[PDB]
Amino acid sequence: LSQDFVEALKAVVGSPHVSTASAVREQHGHDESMHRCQPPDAVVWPQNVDQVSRVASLCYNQGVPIIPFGTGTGVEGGVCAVQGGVCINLTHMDQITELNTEDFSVVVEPGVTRKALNTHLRDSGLWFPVDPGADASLCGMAATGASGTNAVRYGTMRDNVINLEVVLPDGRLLHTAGRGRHYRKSAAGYNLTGLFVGSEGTLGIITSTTLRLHPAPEATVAATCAFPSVQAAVDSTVQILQAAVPVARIEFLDDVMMDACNRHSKLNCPVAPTLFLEFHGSQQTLAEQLQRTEAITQDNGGSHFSWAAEKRNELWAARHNAWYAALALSPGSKAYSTDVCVPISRLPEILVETKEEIKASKLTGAIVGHVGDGNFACILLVDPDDAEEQRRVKAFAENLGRRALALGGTCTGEHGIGLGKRQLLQEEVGPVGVETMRQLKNTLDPRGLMNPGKVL
Ligand SMILES: Cc1cc2nc3c(=O)[nH]c(=O)nc-3n(C[C@H](O)[C@H](O)[C@H](O)COP(=O)(O)OP(=O)(O)OC[C@H]3O[C@@H](n4cnc5c(N)ncnc54)[C@H](O)[C@@H]3O)c2cc1C
Ligand SMILES: CC[C@H](C)[C@@H](O)C(=O)O
Secondary structure, three states: OOHHHHHHHHHHHOHHHEEOOHHHHHHOOOOOOOOOOOOOOEEEOOOOHHHHHHHHHHHHHOOOOEEEEOOOOOOOOOOOOOOOOEEEEOOOOOOEEEEEHHHOEEEEOOOOEHHHHHHHOOOOOEEOOOOOOOOOEHHHHHHHOOOOOOHHHHOOHHHHEEEEEEEOOOOOEEEOOOOOOOOOOOOOOOOHHHHHOOOOOOOOEEEEEEEEOEEOOOEEEEEEEEOOOHHHHHHHHHHHHHOOOOOOEEEEEOHHHHHHHHHHHOOOOOOOOEEEEEEEEOHHHHHHHHHHHHHHHHHOOOOOOEEOOHHHHHHHHHHHOHHHHHHOOOOOOEEEEOEOEOOHHHHHHHHHHHHHHHHHOOOOEEEEEOHHHOEOEEEEEEOOOOHHHHHHHHHHHHHHHHHHHHOOOEOEOOOOOOOOOHHHHHHHHHHHHHHHHHHHHHHHOOOOOEOOOOOO
């Protein structure tokens, strides 16, 4: 990367905000995935949207790949600079604006996390529900199409993104639903906002997100329920959903996951396949829901509920940190995570099969999941220096993904494709789907410089 180009970058953002130092590039060449670190040639921190546009235009017209970088908590190698280029760390634009409590909406820049937004919303009666366990950039969450434990009731990012501000690959500024617009529904034109949700930085740079806010629940109760088997827990989950209990959270942990979370949180739940549950409503609705849900879990062999302000906070903090709890089983390890999502009536088949295959395999794994969505993750620990283990893990993940596809499902419910699921995506949507996705990529990024090598 030439001196002249680096100085042009410095003219846009300032010398402190451009670095070609190896350590800085290495820190921005990987995420939380096991994908190999691939450092960008430079890291750049733009300070406002005009600077993002100018950096994009400089890179694009000079043939230099662009890698958008939020908080680096992705798990599919989205930020790995597989073709080098300029990593654009967006987190210095960290402002909340256009808070409209009367409309239930807010605009956030990439440096705002869910924790920051909800802290700024303390005492407002509103909150933002989509809750990855990581302290992630909200614009990064829009880019990956994230969900979370609350999505079963309150929706995913796709359900809660109203508008996006996007710097297109050549630097043009696009407000996907129109500048300053926010509303509950529209039929106006083609829905551009949905195209950029889940685009993972391959179609443009999200420089602000307009988010739907939600009313705080009148009352909340959390609980845990232990089961004798995976299939008892998952049958209970499906029956709760088919009974239309409007649970706020319903999360599955197998016995391995539950042991791991116990060791990492000083929770002390029975080591068994477990559901973590949360209910929102008034006192009358909560009593109604709790007794319907207890009846269903009891029918399938669930233990009595173990009840959970500080204790529900510890419960969900343990769940949110499940990734790190699993990693702490074998220290020094990395991990790959699967993320399939299937029609809910097929969830018992595939979760039980996954448990049986983990146990039959020489591999170690923990199972945890947003099962209210028909979604779950297998966390598969890896020795970073064991190439034989690595391709056995990758074969296990690919076979699980193909089983989900055979059941009518998708290879990823929330994490995205990045580097790891590109072949599974081709199988999932077939040749006309792939070509159509490619056509969209090419019209927005003709030179192919917008995070190359990802998704497609
Ligand atoms: C402990 C833990 C728990 C997690 N739990 C969940 C969970 O429950 N649900 C879930 O969905 N994910 C979860 N994740 C994954 C991760 O937190 C999400 O995918 C999150 O949305 C990533 O945001 P980020 O800014 O950190 O992404 P990064 O790793 O910085 O980037 C991810 C991808 O999006 C692109 N990108 C980032 N910011 C932008 C932007 N502003 N504009 C355009 N492209 C951009 C990058 O180029 C890359 O391709 C978890 C991760 C961890 C470590
Ligand atoms: C980073 C993978 C894990 C499984 C995350 O998705 C979660 O649900 O806590």
